[model samples]
Target: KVFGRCELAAAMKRHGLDNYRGYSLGNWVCAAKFESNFNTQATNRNTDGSTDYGILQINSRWWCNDGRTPGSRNLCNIPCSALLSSDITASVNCAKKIVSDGNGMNAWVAWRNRCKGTDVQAWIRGCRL
Candidate 1:
């Protein structure tokens, strides 16, 4: 399922992503836009033989257990498949856990490169959330 920009924002907010830490909802929205373009089934293979999964692109190397990433930590203790679901519950939770681990949003390279120090609010502009 590919979510609309505002749709993703509202859904993420409902899941407690709105300022979960110091990052705003716009930060998460911008990350999702740059990470997976709001596609729930998105996946990306890293050069180091790891896979990024779901809308937030949670990494299999450290977060989700794909059973294929070398020395996978599965720190989120969830199957990678969960991140691809339309529900997004597991994906959002895993993302929160990643931040809680002290990585902050920098855990995702896309966020650092694209969202950081930018006007992320544009990612959610005109949305009625």
Candidate 2:
């Protein structure tokens, strides 16, 4: 499902992302904004032809199996389509694994470009969560 900014924040909070890996909800918000604009079904193909999928734009190379990417690690042990579901639980769980695996928010180039070290508070300033 597509989410509004606040809706996404609330969901992330519920899923334990508020301070997961020392990142605030705003960091997650800002990354998702840049990566997918809150769209649950978003996907991108990398220059090397591997694809990134869903809200965090999780990669086919190391996180999920798309059955199309060569040498996919499937570390998250889920199909790429799972990332695009209206239910964001799959996406959130995989995101946790990504940061826990030492990638951190730095795994998202969008986060580095749009969220890193900045006062990302504005990204969730008025959210009711």
Candidate 3:
């Protein structure tokens, strides 16, 4: 079946990102909106002092750059396109890795919290996603 934005959001929510209302989802949605307008297949060079090949605004060159190997960059490593593909699980999983790897959901949560006028990290800190 073809997945849509809400489906993708739900998938992310299932991955322990219960901060859907404020930080987690808010960040993701906003990033997608700003980066690619929620376009799952979107790809673009980094602008506004950003990095390269942002899919979900992932910055492929920084974290996932090694060489070139079909789906390897996006599948096993860090290919922004992989996150933009139809594989929502893979994308979310990859994003989980990025966030869990010390970046924490702070930036994302903060952005969203600003819009919602409240904090959401209280619940996100305990999330495994």
Candidate 4:
């Protein structure tokens, strides 16, 4: 099933991503919007030869292993398909670890390009709860 912005926000809140690492729910909302348009099954291959997986678009190079992708650290220790699930538990947990590991929200390019230093509230504007 496709997830709406509010649904995503609510899931994040339920999973403790609302204020994770000092980042607000709006930040997650904005980043995921640009990354996958809120589709849990979203995946995209990048020009850098790495594929991004799931709603948050965690990359395969370090976050997950796609098996055929060849090189993957699999830091999350889960298959790429795990992130594709609508449940988002795996994806959200991995996302928290990624942001805290070695890098901040900079792990997500969309977060820097849009959510960072911008009016993050606009991302959640008009979304009830």
Candidate 5:
């Protein structure tokens, strides 16, 4: 099952996002705010006929082929829950890698530069994997 508010908070703490009022929490809050408004169950339809899911807005197709098979429908298919599983550190590390790949946070930086004010530092700090 997916983590609720309390479980999510505890998981965040375990993952070194302890200060709920600090930059780390702020970053996650901001990311969730912009992506899915903290809605763990959020899902959106893509123009290319795919779907993005959960608060992190990870794509379902990227993890599982729409849950057609048990093997294909593992934790990766569910971003929020998977992100907080027993081995959450590994999951967060993976996310950090993706964020640093110049494709994740860089894209967010571009978006913030054009749409929101140019708070690159804040944005970067907020989503620091």
Candidate 6:
């Protein structure tokens, strides 16, 4: 299910995003807004035949799977479909790993194109921290 922004923030918080690594929680929320608009089932097809999945839009080529594509690294060791769930535990866990490996949100183009330089306050508006 798709979550309201504040709701998503709280969920992500409960999942350890409040202080996940070096990025602010709002950085994550902003990235997620542009990445998947808070939709757990969100998926985007890449021109390179890879697909991005879930709220964080993790890629299938290296992060998950397409089921048809052979030689997936599955770096996250999870099915792409698993990312498309209301339970963000797996997504958050994988995102943390990506941030550690990929040097923060640098791995997510949406974070650079849309989230970067944007005030993150709106991403958590009205949310009771």
> For this target, which candidate reaches the highest TM-score against the unseen true structure?
2
User: What is the lDDT for 57 in model 6?
Assistant: 96
Q: Give me the runs in candidate 6 sitting further than 4 Å from their true place.
A: none
Give one digit per residue, the lDDT tens place, for model 3 in 31-98. 54445555566655443433333335455544454254223344336544555566555556666665
For candidate 5, the per-residue lDDT at 16 reads: 66
lDDT of 4 by residue, 48-118 (tens): 78899889999888888888566668999998899999799998999999989866898888989877999
For candidate 2, report its TM-score: 0.96
Query: Residue 60, candidate 1: how far off, in angstroms?
Result: 1.1
Per-candidate RMSD, Å: 0.9, 0.9, 7.3, 1.3, 7.4, 1.3
lDDT (C-alpha, whole model) for all candidates: 0.91, 0.91, 0.49, 0.87, 0.47, 0.86
Write candidate 5's Cα lDDT for 11-37 as tens digits. 555676544223344454445457654
Structural similarity to truth (TM-score) of each candidate:
0.96, 0.96, 0.54, 0.92, 0.49, 0.93
Q: Kindly list the per-residue Cα lDDT of model 2 for residues 17-94, writing each as its tens digit.
A: 999989988999999999998999999989888998998899999999999988779999999999999888999999
lDDT of 3 at 76: 37
Worst 10 residues of 1 by lDDT: 99-108
Error of 1 at 28 (Å): 0.3
Off by over 4 Å in 1: none
| Error at 4, model 6, angstroms | 0.6
TM-score of 1: 0.96
Q: What is the lDDT of residue 123 in candidate 5?
A: 36
Best of the two (1, 3) by lDDT: 1
